[PDB]
């Protein structure tokens, strides 16, 4: 049983501190802190119905996909504020959606234990359900695409999985979480993916392999969302305690805590700028907040949303951000100058 | 301003018209959240109203009563460790707690579940409809009298049936007393917090009941009536 587990886990805890050194905040304080970053709503896509659960930027940094509880999956043109596609989703509690890197497929998860993948660039011109992935006993909570051949999906049965859409069966099942997994992030090289669960623990797996490679502890509540650093060796987790944190992938411990006395309500989604200097956080304070990377200080607020900002995404161009909230409005924020 | 972009804008406006129709059909519907145990036969009650629009997890029961349409969303396939779908269900018009009355063993678990419902963080405002089903099973099993109601619940002896009750003519008085004791337990765990925020409506039903849709529509109508009284400053 647990005769040796407690002794064999001692080297896990001391390793994160014995080989560590001073935190990155004091070291990076020598760099110039970014000034008050104010960012304006350049466009508002007031098309959706209900609370917008999740959104995903297209690979072109111009196409958006967003999901609502009614079963609406909408692909917007962000540059002109036009909706390219509207898809009526059958599983009408889609927590998350995603855009395939090739841009031909859009996948939506949800509470209904399945992954619905839809064809965009079909020879017919009408978006039809390409496939449905079944085999998860919990609720799908993140649906990030790996590539056109395979898709990673984490659900509410404390497990994530890697599927191949063409055949359908669960190619690989990653288990090891205690509570339901609420969000995963896929690295830019699409070779490792990190998923965080309600057990206040995150875990990195291997898409080709099947067992966990990294575990991460230090949150005091559910890990509400996780987003990879664009570098690929770090990721940010936003939790219910409003104490969003950054974990270095290799270093295998918490680096610093993004905390303040003003913030009370928890996080709902996290995203990163291309350089990562702008970690935005979709707090439940009814307004997303954009803070720095090296100094861990609040830099601005993307206020303008009546309700909680439920999702947050930075383009692959690193040029704009999109915030989706419970007011059914998607706001595209960009720098004023 | 390009011709292709002009046609793209025309397409976006067509989707805008579709989304306005979508606006109307979403605001013309009221979400309802089933919740209960597996012994409760929630899916049995869902079949009882009408043939459900299947699709596990969602069961997606859209129905109209008296020319008023709304969409109840039966659930139960997800994990029951914490019911984390409740956060997704916080705007729902009402939550239907469905429970059975024959099996006294799980009634303590039913009371615990109702206590968890009535004080949830996302349930501080949502009203609750109580559906006590399989009442005929309880009546028959207590007419047999093999299992005393006193051993599981020692407060039956001190309880005498209230006069406000309107039992059916063929109902045995002890059957009525058991029915209203099992009702009073849930009523008493309900009427302890959030009196004005929500109110738990009780009901008795069985496997076959043609008035399930009418009754649930009336209950949601009362919930909306109170919501409008609060919202439109008439309170």
């Amino acid at each position, epitope marked *: 049983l647990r005769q040796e587990a407690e002794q064999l886990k001692n080297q896990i805890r001391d390793a994160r501190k014995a080989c560590a050194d001073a935190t990155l905040s004091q070291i990076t304080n020598n760099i110039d802190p970014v000034g008050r970053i104010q960012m304006r709503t350049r466009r508002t896509l007031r098309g959706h119905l209900a609370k917008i659960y999740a959104m995903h930027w297209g690979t*072109d940094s*111009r*196409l958006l996909v967003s999901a609502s509880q009614d079963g609406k999956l909408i692909i917007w*043109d962000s*540059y002109t504020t*036009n909706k*390219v*596609h509207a898809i009526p989703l059958r599983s009408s509690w889609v927590m998350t959606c995603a855009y395939a890197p090739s*841009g031909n497929y859009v996948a939506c998860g949800g509470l209904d234990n399945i992954c619905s993948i839809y064809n965009l*660039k079909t*020879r*017919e*011109g*009408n978006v039809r359900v390409s496939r449905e992935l079944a085999g998860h006993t919990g609720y799908l909570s993140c649906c990030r695409f790996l590539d056109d051949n395979q898709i990673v999906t984490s659900s509410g049965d404390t497990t994530c999985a890697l599927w191949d859409i063409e055949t359908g069966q669960q190619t690989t099942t990653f288990t090891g979480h205690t509570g339901d997994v609420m969000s995963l992030s896929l690295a830019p090289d699409t070779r490792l993916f990190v998923s965080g669960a309600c057990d206040a623990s995150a875990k990195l797996w291997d898409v080709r392999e099947g067992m966990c490679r990294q575990t991460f502890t230090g949150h005091e509540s559910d890990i509400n969302a996780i987003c990879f650093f664009p570098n690929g060796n770090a990721f940010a987790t936003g939790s219910d305690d409003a104490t969003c944190r950054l974990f270095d992938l290799r270093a295998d411990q918490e680096l610093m805590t993004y905390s303040h006395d003003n913030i009370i309500c928890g996080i709902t989604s996290v995203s990163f700028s291309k350089s990562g200097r702008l970690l935005l956080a979709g707090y439940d304070d009814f307004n997303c907040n954009v803070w720095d990377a090296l100094k861990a200080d609040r830099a601005g607020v993307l206020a303008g949303h009546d309700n909680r900002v439920s999702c947050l995404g930075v383009t692959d161009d690193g040029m704009a951000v999109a915030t989706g909230s419970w007011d059914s409005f998607l706001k595209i924020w960009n720098g004023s100058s | 301003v*390009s*011709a*292709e*972009d*002009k*046609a*793209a804008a*025309e*397409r976006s406006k*067509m989707i805008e018209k579709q989304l306005q129709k979508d606006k109307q059909v979403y605001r013309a519907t009221h979400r309802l959240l089933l919740l209960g145990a597996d012994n409760s036969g929630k899916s049995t009650i869902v079949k009882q109203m009408r043939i459900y629009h299947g699709g596990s997890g969602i069961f997606e029961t859209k129905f109209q009563v008296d020319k008023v349409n709304f969409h109840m969303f039966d659930v139960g396939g997800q994990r029951d460790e914490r019911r984390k779908w409740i956060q997704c269900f916080n705007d729902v018009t009402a939550i239907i707690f469905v429970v059975d009355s024959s099996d006294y063993n799980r009634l303590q678990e039913a009371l615990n579940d109702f206590k968890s419902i009535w004080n949830n963080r996302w349930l501080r405002t949502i009203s609750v409809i109580l559906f006590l089903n399989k009442q005929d099973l309880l009546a028959e099993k207590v007419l047999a009298g093999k299992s005393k109601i006193e051993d599981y619940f020692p407060e039956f002896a001190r309880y005498t049936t209230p006069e406000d009750a309107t039992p059916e003519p063929g109902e045995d008085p002890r059957v009525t007393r058991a029915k209203y004791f099992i009702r009073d337990e849930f009523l008493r765990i309900s009427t302890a917090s959030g009196d004005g925020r929500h109110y738990c409506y009780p009901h008795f039903t069985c496997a076959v009941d043609t008035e399930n849709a009418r009754r649930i529509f009336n209950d949601c109508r009362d919930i909306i009536q109170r919501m409008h009284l609060r919202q439109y400053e008439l309170l």
Partner: single-chain antibody, 229 residues
Framework: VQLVESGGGLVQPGGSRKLSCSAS????????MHWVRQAPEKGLEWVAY????????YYADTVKGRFTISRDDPKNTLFLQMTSLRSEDTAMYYC??????????????WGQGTTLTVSSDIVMTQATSSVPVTPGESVSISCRSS???????????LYWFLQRPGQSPQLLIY???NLASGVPDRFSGSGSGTAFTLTISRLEAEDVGVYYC?????????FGAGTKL
């Protein structure tokens, strides 16, 4: 996908009649139906266009007026009513599908055309008209335009098509440097400003026919008689 069109043949000048194009299992209710002509042993030319959910019915100034087009989403049929025909209108006809998103493929499928016999704008030149059918080369077709088609968006609006002897012309290069689906990697397109060049990797027996091109900023949709293979 099928866009097979039907109609009659010979008709008098006072032969006001209807010519239809019927589609197979289709997304017709959300497609911007175009309508193209082709003079005998000559190039193509517009006749009309009706967007999905008709709001922008456009015509060509050559035949604007008497000619009319309409869409029928329920029964999925495109009508063309023609009144007071003249001796010029006798030509091949094609019912073409086209819709526009941020990155859509326009003018993909051309239905089997129908014959008709009867008893400013940007100009497409296509000066070259004869090209050898010799295989194993890298021949290219050059295209002129009245003005640069590179709009401020960042995309050109010129379309390319090949026509083998008997069939409707399948698209090759929508916009520039943007291949379609059925067309293989062999075809390609490039250029800059008013200069356009459709290049071919290898030559085989299926590259024969005439090439055609259309501008799209404004809506004359005129063509230029390309190289006969």
């Amino acid at each position: 996908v099928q866009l097979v069109e039907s109609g009659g043949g010979l008709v008098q000048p006072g032969g006001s009649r209807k010519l239809s194009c019927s589609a197979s299992g289709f997304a017709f209710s959300s497609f911007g139906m175009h309508w193209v002509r082709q003079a005998p042993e000559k190039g193509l030319e517009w006749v009309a266009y009706i967007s999905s959910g008709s709001g922008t019915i456009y015509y060509a100034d050559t035949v604007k007026g008497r000619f009319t087009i309409s869409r029928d989403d329920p029964k999925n049929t495109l009508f063309l009513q023609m009144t007071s025909l003249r001796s010029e209108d006798t030509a091949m006809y094609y019912c073409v599908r086209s819709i526009y998103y941020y990155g859509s493929s326009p003018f993909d499928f051309w239905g089997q055309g129908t014959t008709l016999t009867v008893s400013s704008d940007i100009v497409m030149t296509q000066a070259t008209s004869s090209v050898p059918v010799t295989p194993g080369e890298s021949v290219s077709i050059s295209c002129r335009s009245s003005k640069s088609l590179l709009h401020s968006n960042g995309n050109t609006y010129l379309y390319w098509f090949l026509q083998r002897p008997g069939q409707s012309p399948q698209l090759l290069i929508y916009r520039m440097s943007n291949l379609a689906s059925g067309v293989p990697d062999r075809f390609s397109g490039s250029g800059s400003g008013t200069a356009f060049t459709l290049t071919i990797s290898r030559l085989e027996a299926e590259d024969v026919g005439v090439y055609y091109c259309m501008q799209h900023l404004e809506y004359p949709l005129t063509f230029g008689a390309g190289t006969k293979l």
